[PDB]
């Protein structure tokens, strides 16, 4: 049993190190390259900041919680860690939604949008994403025990208290995952239609969109689906969801934050060149 938890700790440390160095490289590649200081890469810096908050704080504390079998750090630290984790995860998903909207507007309207891709619109979209995430999760997590009046979460474990209440659970899942994945799927399908359409129109005047565009959506969906399925099944069937399957879903959500740079930042050649510069030193 010691080899199993050593293997789990090693795998979680490797993936936390990978996402930390990836988001640090995306910040450094924006900072040291003035060609990358564009309006559209501010959204990627927002995403990178959210994923770095996830990779530094959330993964390691989660793993230690799984490995020790208990929180053992106080109820206040549990509530603050849960609030920070959920706010950062939702900020990451909101950033993905905002990036998808930016790509959709710059693809379907490539000339009209260029005059509306100002730094003030990018800043207000990033601020709206982070504010929506904070309003959606932080008062719900930190103040549910005062609204109910009792703390039903046991002291040894760390878990959101409203995950038992069906309404708030479905509401905070359809406002955090189902509507964003639906809008992202619709926008990326419309993007695929626009690419096929331009190729046909050009041939009427005179693929790579199958791998990248379908690997972004599947890397989001595979890594965020089982948590959002097990929360909605656990709010009714109390003990259906196994314990190891639950922990794996929770972790997979972090895995998405690990694989986020590769799907958004690394797609841009100027980042790949800056990363090949940065790694070697």
């Amino acid at each position: 049993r010691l080899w199993e938890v050593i293997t789990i700790a090693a795998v979680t440390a490797v993936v936390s190190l990978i996402t930390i160095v990836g988001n640090v490289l995306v910040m450094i590649s924006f900072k040291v390259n003035s060609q990358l200081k564009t309006v559209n890469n501010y959204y990627l810096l927002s995403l990178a900041c959210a994923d770095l908050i996830i990779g530094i704080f959330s993964m390691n504390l989660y793993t230690t919680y799984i490995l020790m079998g208990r929180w053992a750090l106080g109820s206040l630290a549990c509530d603050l860690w849960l609030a920070l984790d959920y706010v950062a995860s939702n900020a990451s998903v909101m950033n993905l939604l905002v990036i998808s909207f930016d790509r959709y507007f710059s693809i379907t309207r490539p000339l009209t949008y260029r005059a509306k891709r100002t730094p003030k619109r990018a800043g207000i979209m990033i601020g709206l994403a982070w504010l929506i995430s904070f309003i959606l999760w932080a008062p719900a997590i930190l103040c549910w025990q005062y609204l109910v009046g009792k703390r039903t979460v046991p002291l040894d474990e760390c878990q959101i208290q409203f995950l038992s209440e069906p309404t708030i659970t479905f509401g905070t899942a359809i406002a955090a995952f189902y509507i964003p994945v639906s809008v992202m799927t619709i926008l990326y399908c419309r993007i695929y239609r626009e690419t096929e359409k331009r190729t046909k129109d050009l041939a009427d005047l005179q693929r790579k969109a199958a791998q990248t565009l379908s690997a972004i959506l599947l890397a989001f969906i595979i890594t965020w689906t089982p948590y959002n399925i097990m929360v909605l099944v656990s709010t009714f069937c109390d003990k259906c969801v196994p314990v190891t399957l639950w922990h794996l879903g929770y972790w997979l959500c972090y895995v998405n934050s690990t694989v986020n740079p590769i799907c958004y930042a690394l797609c841009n050649r100027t980042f790949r060149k800056t990363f090949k510069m940065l790694l070697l030193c």
Binding site: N40, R103, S106, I107, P110, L111, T112, R114, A115, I191, E194, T195, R198, T199, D201, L202, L205, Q206, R207, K208, A209, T212, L213, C267, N268, R269
Partner: protein, 213 residues
Amino acid sequence: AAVERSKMIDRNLREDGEKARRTLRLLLLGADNSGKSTIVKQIFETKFQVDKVNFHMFDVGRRKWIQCFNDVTAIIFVVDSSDYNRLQEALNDFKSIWNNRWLRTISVILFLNKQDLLAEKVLASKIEDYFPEFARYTTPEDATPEPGEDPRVTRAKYFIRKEFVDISTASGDGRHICYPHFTCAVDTENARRIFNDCKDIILQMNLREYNLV
């Protein structure tokens, strides 16, 4: 004190750079008597606006100042399709522009001008004498003549386009794309054709931005 003057200049520099990046710069090229000045009905600079998007066309009244237009959106190349003696010279002029060191990421908006004189010439003067490849050439089955035109006109028009797109498909390999067309003497839709082609150029830049095409 001098640092604040330099910071006040940088506010004025970024304000002028936003207006410069908000318009599209175009290079107008072509041979003599090809009607370059009559392409748009609205060094010499021409300004016109289509769908609240500002365009800037520049023409110079040989092969050395082409480095100054490395960052333009597109190159508007105008060919006189009426005459055939200078048509081979215009084909070689397009080949040098397409296979240029500083023009590899710059798409070319081709404008085969004077198609009404081309239609009058083929209905009367032999294109086969000036081009031996027009013999044993057939119109493709997926061809749509728009204004109910004669098949001899359509075969002649598709042959002139074909000779200008085998040059474009020989090199480049998707980095920059030639967008052919046809223009009469009194055609007023050239502003929309430039707008639709510059729509595709920025879109292809955006698809390469997101690694989609």
